Amino acid sequence: ASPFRLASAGEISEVQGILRTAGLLGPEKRIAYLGVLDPARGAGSEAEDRRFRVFIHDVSGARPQEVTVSVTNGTVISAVELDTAATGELPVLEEEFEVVEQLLATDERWLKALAARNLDVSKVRVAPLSAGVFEYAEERGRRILRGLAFVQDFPEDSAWAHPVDGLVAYVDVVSKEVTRVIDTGVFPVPAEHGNYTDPELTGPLRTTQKPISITQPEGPSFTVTGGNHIEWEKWSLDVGFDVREGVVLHNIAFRDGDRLRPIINRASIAEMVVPYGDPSPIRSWQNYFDTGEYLVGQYANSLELGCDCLGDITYLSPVISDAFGNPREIRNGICMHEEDWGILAKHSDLWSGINYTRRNRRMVISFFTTIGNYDYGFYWYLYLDGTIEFEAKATGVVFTSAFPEGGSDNISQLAPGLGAPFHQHIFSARLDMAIDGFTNRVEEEDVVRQTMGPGNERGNAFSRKRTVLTRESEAVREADARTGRTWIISNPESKNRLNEPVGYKLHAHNQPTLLADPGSSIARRAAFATKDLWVTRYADDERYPTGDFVNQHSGGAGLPSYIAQDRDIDGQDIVVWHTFGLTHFPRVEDWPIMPVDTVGFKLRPEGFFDRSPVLDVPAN
Amino acid sequence: ASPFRLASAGEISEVQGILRTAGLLGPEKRIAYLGVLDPARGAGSEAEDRRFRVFIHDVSGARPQEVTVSVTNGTVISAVELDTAATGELPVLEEEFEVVEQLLATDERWLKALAARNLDVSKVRVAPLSAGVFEYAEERGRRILRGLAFVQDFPEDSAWAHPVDGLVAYVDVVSKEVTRVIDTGVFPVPAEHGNYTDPELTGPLRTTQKPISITQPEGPSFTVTGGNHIEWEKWSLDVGFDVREGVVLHNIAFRDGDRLRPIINRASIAEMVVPYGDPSPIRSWQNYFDTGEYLVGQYANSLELGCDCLGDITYLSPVISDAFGNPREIRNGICMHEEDWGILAKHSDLWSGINYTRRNRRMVISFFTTIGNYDYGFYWYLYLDGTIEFEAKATGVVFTSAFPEGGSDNISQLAPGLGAPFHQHIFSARLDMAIDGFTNRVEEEDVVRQTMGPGNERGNAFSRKRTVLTRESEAVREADARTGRTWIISNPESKNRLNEPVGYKLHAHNQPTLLADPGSSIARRAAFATKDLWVTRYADDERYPTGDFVNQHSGGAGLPSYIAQDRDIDGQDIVVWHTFGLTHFPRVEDWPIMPVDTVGFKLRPEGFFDRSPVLDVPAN
Ligand code: R9A
Ligand code: R9A
Ligand SMILES: [Cu+2]
Ligand SMILES: [Cu+2]
Ligand code: NA
Ligand code: NA
């Protein structure tokens, strides 16, 4: 009966039914996004109203609509026609992916370009890539994808080994017209294959790995009820799933004695962007908002046992809508398991004679998605000691180009003639905080060095300072690793036994933020990515740091517009938005398939508890 | 037959025998340090000469000696009398620990101080703490320990809950005299117990944790030969152990096809210091060089199976000397196991139809040591993909004080009246590099932002720059997290298939370095801790960043003196010294026993290999 339960197949077909009955889902309509809305604040008292939000595209060229449906009541709550030139195009549709290659294959300009390179059109794959917003005035209000070409020598060949540089095309996927074909000159198409299952390249497979077996003879220590409610080692939460954000955690709380204490109301990765740093006009427009433009949840992998997820795994199989409003299950799309995490606490005391050791564990909730060449794992971790962590695991195949004769300041060489343009992968975690409830505030904490002198005659003292962020105008913050900067979210009305406000401290990795010039299109479209930490006052319509419609949408929406309201955040219902990412200068070791690299953040209790919360963990 | 084999009990008793025969180890002599020396450069050609270095203390007050013995040849190579006022006192002896409490228990000043606080002397434990170098001229050339008092209410009580603030004593442990007793005034001795095995404090232990079983039905994938030579998944190394440094890795190399390629010649934690940031005269002298002053290897725990180390564990049991030169085994003092490390690489390709997933693993080599209240785990990790990592796990019981009425800028409150002074734990990793051999150099790599303009019209380009550190005077470097600063160690004479020098990139955590005023005693004694990265030219006598004798030793030795030589490091046999640490403002959650916190660093291949080194890893 939980209002935070996953969407069921039945609910999706019912949204379809309601939209049809209302005249909003005829044969020319396509669902570009569909997801359940979270309950309103204070809704617990009233009965359930399961509401769904839908973006409806029209293949005949009519204006799309944003629609909210009550599936409980069988009604349309609201429907509004969108002006996409103003507020943004709808997310890329799965069905549009094939269209770029298909249209290009009979375009005379494209064919001339392929013929100049002696490339068989039947062997040329075209990546359907988001277009962004640049200088092409004809694209405003049109659904455009840009195409970069890669040669596939045979059906099982990795096309990424054979980029066709110097060539890019722009296509209108609604009118089905090729708008531009740009050919800046021929580059050699790299010839070596990148087939990482071919014995010629791998050599003989290792026979040296002996089995590791991880089992739980009594089953897992967590329970799942109501489909998605998890209880594990004092933690309580609901695991949601949304086609845009992927796995979303709701109602993260910790049972401290007899009281269920909220910590985070909602945690998600609300955006991720991959800006490229190659100034070639073939790629200088490239910025993939995997979450906002493509919808990472839609491409979640079905995860195989003993392969993607090892141990005693409990799976969830979230349901999403296809383009027509029919439910589609992502079988085994979410993994849940607990795992050992080494030593938790240890002391061998000389005076008491007591030797004490306890083991740590973490609950893991994850999914893996594939967006073209990229594959990303999204992992949430809950630890015995109250720590909450996120980790992103980046792998897949690097996006390639030619490697220029004479080298490049913006591209690395992977193989003979084969380049990998420099890029970043930058995430935004949206943390709707509820430290002991909704009345929260954020302080920035810096280490403070002290001068040798009176009060500090030996020059050993050091301290720290905390600055409360009182209003949104003061809440756009940068990292300072040198001063050990962190941010504490506390509840000023909830004190621990030592009369101090309870809190959690956010520890960032302090990786570089968005590198692009601040006057670039990407600095405006991904403004969030220019600063490490933002704090807003909660509002129901402030969901994504880039706004609701990212595809081909200029600046104007998202975090910079939210904070202009300059609202009170000092003891209020607030949301922390943390930017973190990887800056990738690809190495030869990343080719032909990339070993995982990671980035993330964590939050640790900071006077939240009255003493260690793991004193009751048993030995051995 | 390996010259890198662990010291045997037989070798230690033979050093004892040689020293005795030579007249250097009579009844008043005590061994304060004993360890095997590494083979000289180019020694492989010649037959083994196992040499041991020994620091010999004299309990009658005679000058100590530094002695080198050839155990192979049964000879004393060299013996030199030390002037400790100049070059430093010998490491603290285990036998001196009890002496501080014992002497103080019949000192009238100490007894007066305890009586003023109504404390039974039989219940007062005294910590034997390193003294450092301050303003007390009488201490120069004398072996001093300082004592801080903690009340133990009964034999099994945790004394750390009951610090006796406002009181400190200084003791000469050779002449066995109390030099000073300082009483700045009474503070309340905190009364709450910190007994983390007492059911009153823990409450009922959890019954919710179900077993996790980790087994290897065919045994481990690594082999051990010659006692300490490890071969695992293309890696090759020797696991050494030294009473000062603890676990030391030698000859880390990777088998790439048919060639065994060196990476690191020697890896160790060559120092660790814990500076305290409380300006109270009771603690303002407190800086524990756990490695240099106490010898972390000497206090390595015997690690219990399924408790400290989980899985299919192979143990080593290193042998050290006691104070008289008799061998003592640390049973199960080193853990070795491999463990699963999630996904290694993954891609689901739309064009080829090939779905590919591979699992990662790491080899773990660790030990755990206890120094008073502190317990530290030292972990070395080798990954399938060529990554090398170190991690330190800090736990134990926090060092306590009174919490002042009216608060403190330098102490946090843990419990009523109970304080925890702010401090850091700072490590120095000494990495004697051998990237494809000994001809190495280091570059500092920064991300480079680019301005929108000609050549970069869209303002998206970014790049990087590398600066070769050519001489030691230019090789003292600081972190810059904002610019993504790393350091690459390469071999300029060994190129990969793309004609680029092979390399490894060091990724630091960029935590704060030493906070103390640069004119303090600790900034001089722990000068290494003020900068993130140092590079020296290799020399056999440059072992520790603080020199050979740290105890009561001023500046004058260590890294600052080594780099003054301004030697060539551009394509030479070099050593990287990386400073990294934790800055600890204790939280209520750290009490009464601290959950593990971590810090470390890693090195990843950077064009070392000609493509991914894990293409030959099998499925499932
Ligand atoms: C942003 N960037 C840089 C980017 C760069 C490049 C691309 C891009 O776009 C985003 C892509 C989203 C993630 C990536 C796409 C998201 C998933 C959508 C999906 C699918 C898609 C595309 C396919 C395909 C598929 N299949 Ru498949 N197959 C073949 C050829 C092309 N298939 C589909 C339709 C018709 C025929 C087939 C077919 C025929 C024989 C063998 C395999 N297939 N298929 C069918 C049945 C069972 C299993 C499969 C299967 C299994 C693995 C791979 C392909 N197919 C399943 C699901 C973005
Ligand atoms: C730098 N800082 C901040 C610092 C702060 C505070 C202290 C300090 O100093 C560094 C300490 C080094 C690590 C810390 C010290 C390094 C280890 C040296 C060791 C031992 C040491 C001190 C003991 C003791 C010991 N024992 Ru234990 N015992 C009792 C009382 C005090 N013992 C030793 C001698 C005589 C009698 C006993 C005895 C009697 C009954 C029960 C237990 N003991 N002992 C004996 C046999 C078997 C097992 C034990 C045993 C097991 C656990 C704890 C104690 N004993 C074993 C090893 C440094
Ligand atoms: Cu990347
Ligand atoms: Cu600490
Ligand atoms: Na909130
Ligand atoms: Na070297």
Coordinates of all heavy atoms in Angstrom, one line a residue, chain A residues 133-189:
Chain A
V133 N 22.8 23.3 -28.8 CA 22.4 24.6 -29.3 C 23.6 25.4 -29.6 O 24.4 25.8 -28.8 CB 21.6 25.4 -28.2 CG1 21.1 26.7 -28.8 CG2 20.4 24.6 -27.7
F134 N 23.7 25.6 -30.9 CA 24.9 26.4 -31.5 C 24.4 27.5 -32.4 O 23.4 28.2 -32.1 CB 25.9 25.4 -32.1 CG 26.5 24.5 -31.0 CD1 25.9 23.3 -30.7 CD2 27.5 25.0 -30.2 CE1 26.4 22.5 -29.7 CE2 28.0 24.2 -29.1 CZ 27.4 23.0 -28.9
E135 N 25.0 27.6 -33.6 CA 24.8 28.9 -34.4 C 23.8 28.7 -35.5 O 23.5 29.6 -36.4 CB 26.1 29.3 -35.0 CG 27.3 29.2 -34.0 CD 27.9 27.8 -33.8 OE1 27.6 27.0 -34.7 OE2 28.7 27.6 -32.9
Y136 N 23.1 27.5 -35.6 CA 22.3 27.1 -36.7 C 20.9 27.5 -36.5 O 20.1 26.7 -35.9 CB 22.5 25.6 -37.0 CG 23.9 25.1 -37.1 CD1 24.5 24.3 -36.1 CD2 24.7 25.5 -38.2 CE1 25.8 23.8 -36.2 CE2 26.0 25.1 -38.3 CZ 26.6 24.3 -37.3 OH 27.9 23.8 -37.4
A137 N 20.5 28.7 -37.0 CA 19.2 29.2 -36.6 C 18.0 28.4 -37.1 O 16.9 28.4 -36.4 CB 19.0 30.6 -37.1
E138 N 18.2 27.6 -38.1 CA 17.1 26.7 -38.7 C 16.7 25.6 -37.7 O 15.7 25.0 -37.9 CB 17.5 26.2 -40.1 CG 18.4 24.9 -40.1 CD 19.9 25.3 -40.0 OE1 20.3 26.4 -39.9 OE2 20.7 24.3 -40.2
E139 N 17.6 25.3 -36.8 CA 17.4 24.2 -35.8 C 16.4 24.5 -34.7 O 15.9 23.6 -34.0 CB 18.7 23.7 -35.2 CG 19.7 23.1 -36.3 CD 20.9 22.6 -35.7 OE1 21.2 22.8 -34.5 OE2 21.6 21.9 -36.5
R140 N 16.2 25.8 -34.5 CA 15.3 26.3 -33.4 C 13.9 25.9 -33.6 O 13.2 26.3 -34.5 CB 15.5 27.8 -33.2 CG 16.8 28.2 -32.4 CD 17.8 29.0 -33.1 NE 17.3 30.3 -33.4 CZ 18.1 31.4 -33.7 NH1 19.4 31.3 -33.6 NH2 17.5 32.6 -34.0
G141 N 13.3 25.1 -32.6 CA 12.0 24.5 -32.7 C 11.9 23.2 -33.5 O 10.8 22.6 -33.7
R142 N 13.1 22.7 -34.0 CA 13.1 21.4 -34.8 C 13.9 20.3 -34.0 O 14.8 20.6 -33.2 CB 13.8 21.6 -36.1 CG 13.2 22.7 -37.0 CD 11.8 22.6 -37.3 NE 11.5 21.3 -37.9 CZ 10.4 21.0 -38.6 NH1 9.4 21.9 -38.7 NH2 10.2 19.8 -39.2
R143 N 13.4 19.1 -34.1 CA 14.1 17.9 -33.5 C 15.2 17.5 -34.4 O 15.0 16.8 -35.4 CB 13.1 16.8 -33.3 CG 12.3 16.8 -32.1 CD 11.4 15.6 -32.0 NE 12.0 14.4 -31.3 CZ 12.4 14.4 -30.1 NH1 12.2 15.4 -29.2 NH2 13.0 13.3 -29.6
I144 N 16.4 17.8 -34.0 CA 17.7 17.5 -34.7 C 18.5 16.5 -34.0 O 18.6 16.5 -32.8 CB 18.5 18.8 -34.9 CG1 17.7 19.9 -35.5 CG2 19.8 18.5 -35.7 CD1 17.4 19.8 -37.0
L145 N 19.1 15.5 -34.8 CA 20.2 14.7 -34.3 C 21.3 14.9 -35.2 O 21.1 15.1 -36.4 CB 19.8 13.2 -34.2 CG 18.7 12.9 -33.1 CD1 18.3 11.4 -33.3 CD2 19.3 13.1 -31.8
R146 N 22.6 14.8 -34.7 CA 23.8 14.9 -35.5 C 24.4 13.5 -35.6 O 24.2 12.7 -34.7 CB 24.8 15.8 -34.9 CG 24.2 17.2 -34.5 CD 25.3 18.3 -34.2 NE 24.7 19.4 -33.5 CZ 24.0 20.4 -34.2 NH1 23.8 20.4 -35.5 NH2 23.5 21.4 -33.5
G147 N 25.0 13.2 -36.7 CA 25.5 11.8 -37.0 C 27.0 11.8 -37.2 O 27.5 12.6 -38.0
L148 N 27.7 11.0 -36.4 CA 29.1 10.7 -36.7 C 29.2 9.3 -37.1 O 28.5 8.4 -36.6 CB 29.9 10.9 -35.4 CG 30.1 12.4 -35.1 CD1 30.8 12.6 -33.7 CD2 30.8 13.2 -36.2
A149 N 30.1 9.0 -38.0 CA 30.2 7.7 -38.8 C 31.3 6.9 -38.2 O 32.4 7.4 -37.9 CB 30.3 8.0 -40.2
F150 N 31.1 5.5 -38.2 CA 32.0 4.5 -37.8 C 31.8 3.3 -38.7 O 30.7 2.9 -38.9 CB 31.7 4.1 -36.3 CG 31.9 5.2 -35.3 CD1 30.9 6.2 -35.1 CD2 33.2 5.4 -34.7 CE1 31.1 7.2 -34.2 CE2 33.3 6.4 -33.8 CZ 32.3 7.3 -33.5
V151 N 32.9 2.8 -39.2 CA 32.8 1.6 -40.1 C 32.8 0.3 -39.3 O 33.6 0.1 -38.4 CB 34.1 1.6 -41.0 CG1 33.9 0.4 -42.0 CG2 34.2 2.9 -41.8
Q152 N 31.9 -0.6 -39.7 CA 31.8 -1.9 -39.1 C 32.1 -2.9 -40.3 O 31.5 -2.9 -41.3 CB 30.3 -2.1 -38.6 CG 30.2 -3.0 -37.5 CD 28.8 -3.4 -37.1 OE1 27.9 -2.8 -37.6 NE2 28.7 -4.3 -36.1
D153 N 33.3 -3.6 -40.1 CA 33.8 -4.4 -41.2 C 33.0 -5.7 -41.5 O 33.0 -6.2 -42.6 CB 35.2 -4.8 -40.9 CG 36.2 -3.7 -41.2 OD1 36.0 -2.9 -42.1 OD2 37.3 -3.6 -40.5
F154 N 32.3 -6.1 -40.4 CA 31.4 -7.3 -40.5 C 30.5 -7.2 -39.3 O 30.7 -6.4 -38.4 CB 32.2 -8.6 -40.5 CG 33.3 -8.6 -39.4 CD1 33.0 -9.2 -38.1 CD2 34.6 -8.2 -39.6 CE1 33.9 -9.3 -37.1 CE2 35.5 -8.2 -38.6 CZ 35.2 -8.8 -37.4
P155 N 29.4 -8.0 -39.3 CA 28.3 -7.8 -38.3 C 28.8 -7.7 -36.8 O 28.2 -7.0 -36.1 CB 27.4 -9.0 -38.5 CG 27.6 -9.4 -39.9 CD 29.0 -9.0 -40.3
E156 N 29.8 -8.5 -36.4 CA 30.3 -8.6 -35.0 C 31.5 -7.7 -34.7 O 32.1 -7.7 -33.7 CB 30.6 -10.0 -34.7 CG 29.4 -10.9 -34.5 CD 29.8 -12.2 -33.8 OE1 30.5 -13.1 -34.4 OE2 29.5 -12.4 -32.6
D157 N 31.8 -6.8 -35.7 CA 33.0 -5.9 -35.5 C 32.6 -4.7 -34.6 O 31.5 -4.2 -34.7 CB 33.3 -5.4 -36.9 CG 34.7 -4.7 -37.0 OD1 35.6 -5.2 -36.3 OD2 34.9 -3.7 -37.7
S158 N 33.6 -4.2 -33.9 CA 33.4 -3.1 -33.0 C 33.7 -1.8 -33.9 O 34.8 -1.6 -34.3 CB 34.4 -3.1 -31.8 OG 34.2 -1.9 -31.1
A159 N 32.7 -1.1 -34.2 CA 32.7 0.0 -35.2 C 33.6 1.1 -34.6 O 34.1 1.9 -35.4 CB 31.4 0.5 -35.5
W160 N 33.7 1.2 -33.3 CA 34.4 2.3 -32.6 C 35.9 2.3 -32.9 O 36.5 3.4 -32.8 CB 34.2 2.1 -31.1 CG 32.8 1.9 -30.7 CD1 32.2 0.7 -30.3 CD2 31.8 2.9 -30.7 NE1 30.9 0.9 -30.1 CE2 30.6 2.2 -30.3 CE3 31.7 4.3 -30.9 CZ2 29.4 2.9 -30.2 CZ3 30.5 4.9 -30.8 CH2 29.3 4.2 -30.5
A161 N 36.4 1.2 -33.4 CA 37.8 1.1 -33.8 C 38.0 1.9 -35.2 O 39.2 2.1 -35.5 CB 38.2 -0.3 -34.0
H162 N 37.0 2.2 -35.9 CA 37.0 2.8 -37.2 C 36.2 4.1 -37.4 O 35.4 4.1 -38.2 CB 36.5 1.7 -38.2 CG 37.1 0.3 -38.0 ND1 38.4 0.1 -38.1 CD2 36.5 -0.9 -37.8 CE1 38.7 -1.2 -37.9 NE2 37.5 -1.8 -37.7
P163 N 36.6 5.1 -36.6 CA 35.8 6.4 -36.8 C 36.1 7.0 -38.1 O 37.3 6.8 -38.6 CB 36.4 7.2 -35.7 CG 37.8 6.7 -35.5 CD 37.6 5.2 -35.6
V164 N 35.2 7.7 -38.7 CA 35.3 8.4 -40.0 C 35.3 9.9 -39.6 O 34.3 10.5 -39.5 CB 34.1 8.1 -40.9 CG1 34.3 8.8 -42.3 CG2 33.9 6.6 -41.1
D165 N 36.6 10.4 -39.5 CA 36.8 11.7 -39.0 C 36.6 12.7 -40.2 O 36.7 12.2 -41.4 CB 38.1 11.9 -38.4 CG 38.1 12.9 -37.3 OD1 37.3 13.9 -37.3 OD2 38.9 12.8 -36.3
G166 N 36.4 13.9 -39.9 CA 36.3 15.0 -41.0 C 34.9 15.1 -41.5 O 34.6 15.8 -42.5
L167 N 33.9 14.3 -41.0 CA 32.6 14.2 -41.5 C 31.6 14.2 -40.4 O 31.7 13.4 -39.5 CB 32.5 12.9 -42.3 CG 31.1 12.6 -42.9 CD1 30.7 13.6 -44.0 CD2 31.1 11.1 -43.5
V168 N 30.5 15.0 -40.6 CA 29.4 15.1 -39.7 C 28.2 15.5 -40.4 O 28.2 16.3 -41.4 CB 29.7 16.0 -38.4 CG1 29.9 17.4 -38.8 CG2 28.6 15.9 -37.4
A169 N 27.0 14.9 -40.1 CA 25.7 15.3 -40.7 C 24.7 15.7 -39.6 O 24.7 15.2 -38.5 CB 25.2 14.2 -41.5
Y170 N 23.8 16.6 -40.0 CA 22.7 17.0 -39.2 C 21.4 16.6 -39.8 O 21.2 16.7 -41.0 CB 22.7 18.5 -39.0 CG 24.0 19.2 -38.6 CD1 24.3 20.5 -38.8 CD2 25.1 18.4 -38.0 CE1 25.4 21.1 -38.4 CE2 26.3 19.0 -37.6 CZ 26.4 20.4 -37.8 OH 27.6 21.0 -37.4
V171 N 20.4 16.0 -39.0 CA 19.2 15.4 -39.6 C 18.0 15.9 -38.8 O 18.0 15.9 -37.5 CB 19.3 13.9 -39.6 CG1 18.0 13.3 -40.1 CG2 20.4 13.4 -40.5
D172 N 16.9 16.2 -39.4 CA 15.6 16.5 -38.8 C 14.8 15.2 -38.8 O 14.4 14.8 -39.8 CB 14.8 17.6 -39.7 CG 13.6 18.1 -39.0 OD1 12.9 17.3 -38.4 OD2 13.3 19.3 -39.1
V173 N 14.7 14.7 -37.6 CA 14.1 13.3 -37.5 C 12.5 13.3 -37.5 O 12.0 12.2 -37.5 CB 14.6 12.6 -36.2 CG1 16.1 12.4 -36.3 CG2 14.2 13.3 -34.9
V174 N 11.9 14.5 -37.6 CA 10.4 14.5 -37.7 C 10.0 14.7 -39.2 O 9.3 13.9 -39.7 CB 9.8 15.6 -36.9 CG1 8.3 15.7 -37.0 CG2 10.2 15.4 -35.4
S175 N 10.6 15.7 -39.9 CA 10.4 15.9 -41.3 C 11.2 14.9 -42.1 O 11.0 14.7 -43.3 CB 10.7 17.3 -41.8 OG 12.1 17.5 -41.7
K176 N 12.1 14.2 -41.5 CA 13.0 13.2 -42.1 C 13.7 13.8 -43.3 O 13.6 13.3 -44.4 CB 12.1 12.0 -42.5 CG 11.7 11.2 -41.2 CD 10.6 10.2 -41.5 CE 10.5 9.2 -40.4 NZ 10.7 9.8 -39.0
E177 N 14.5 14.9 -43.0 CA 15.3 15.6 -44.0 C 16.7 15.7 -43.4 O 16.9 15.9 -42.2 CB 14.8 17.0 -44.2 CG 13.4 17.1 -44.7 CD 12.9 18.5 -44.7 OE1 12.7 19.1 -43.6 OE2 12.7 19.1 -45.8
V178 N 17.7 15.6 -44.3 CA 19.1 15.9 -44.0 C 19.4 17.4 -44.1 O 19.4 17.8 -45.3 CB 20.1 15.0 -44.8 CG1 21.5 15.4 -44.4 CG2 19.8 13.6 -44.6
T179 N 19.6 18.1 -43.0 CA 19.8 19.5 -43.1 C 21.2 20.0 -43.6 O 21.3 21.0 -44.3 CB 19.5 20.2 -41.8 OG1 20.3 19.6 -40.8 CG2 18.0 20.0 -41.4
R180 N 22.2 19.3 -43.1 CA 23.6 19.7 -43.5 C 24.4 18.4 -43.5 O 24.3 17.5 -42.7 CB 24.2 20.7 -42.5 CG 23.5 22.0 -42.3 CD 24.3 23.0 -41.5 NE 23.5 24.2 -41.1 CZ 23.9 25.5 -41.5 NH1 25.0 25.7 -42.2 NH2 23.1 26.5 -41.1
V181 N 25.4 18.4 -44.4 CA 26.5 17.4 -44.4 C 27.8 18.2 -44.5 O 28.0 18.9 -45.5 CB 26.4 16.4 -45.6 CG1 27.5 15.4 -45.6 CG2 25.0 15.7 -45.6
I182 N 28.6 18.1 -43.5 CA 29.9 18.8 -43.4 C 31.0 17.9 -43.6 O 31.2 16.9 -42.9 CB 30.0 19.5 -42.0 CG1 28.9 20.6 -41.9 CG2 31.4 20.1 -41.8 CD1 28.9 21.3 -40.6
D183 N 31.8 18.2 -44.6 CA 33.0 17.4 -44.9 C 34.2 18.3 -44.9 O 34.4 19.1 -45.8 CB 32.9 16.7 -46.2 CG 34.0 15.7 -46.5 OD1 35.0 15.7 -45.8 OD2 33.9 14.8 -47.4
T184 N 35.1 18.3 -43.9 CA 36.3 19.1 -43.7 C 37.5 18.5 -44.3 O 38.6 19.2 -44.3 CB 36.5 19.5 -42.2 OG1 36.7 18.3 -41.4 CG2 35.3 20.2 -41.6
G185 N 37.4 17.3 -44.8 CA 38.5 16.6 -45.4 C 38.6 15.2 -45.0 O 38.2 14.9 -43.9
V186 N 39.3 14.4 -45.8 CA 39.5 13.0 -45.4 C 40.6 12.8 -44.4 O 41.6 13.5 -44.4 CB 39.7 12.1 -46.7 CG1 38.6 12.3 -47.7 CG2 41.1 12.4 -47.3
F187 N 40.3 12.0 -43.4 CA 41.3 11.4 -42.5 C 41.4 9.9 -42.8 O 40.3 9.3 -43.0 CB 40.9 11.6 -41.1 CG 41.0 13.0 -40.6 CD1 40.0 13.9 -40.8 CD2 42.0 13.4 -39.7 CE1 40.0 15.2 -40.3 CE2 42.1 14.7 -39.2 CZ 41.0 15.6 -39.5
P188 N 42.5 9.3 -42.6 CA 42.6 7.8 -42.6 C 41.6 7.2 -41.6 O 41.6 7.6 -40.4 CB 44.0 7.5 -42.2 CG 44.8 8.8 -42.5 CD 43.8 9.9 -42.2
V189 N 40.8 6.2 -42.0 CA 40.0 5.5 -41.1 C 40.9 4.5 -40.4 O 41.4 3.6 -41.2 CB 38.8 4.8 -41.8 CG1 38.0 4.0 -40.8 CG2 37.9 5.9 -42.4

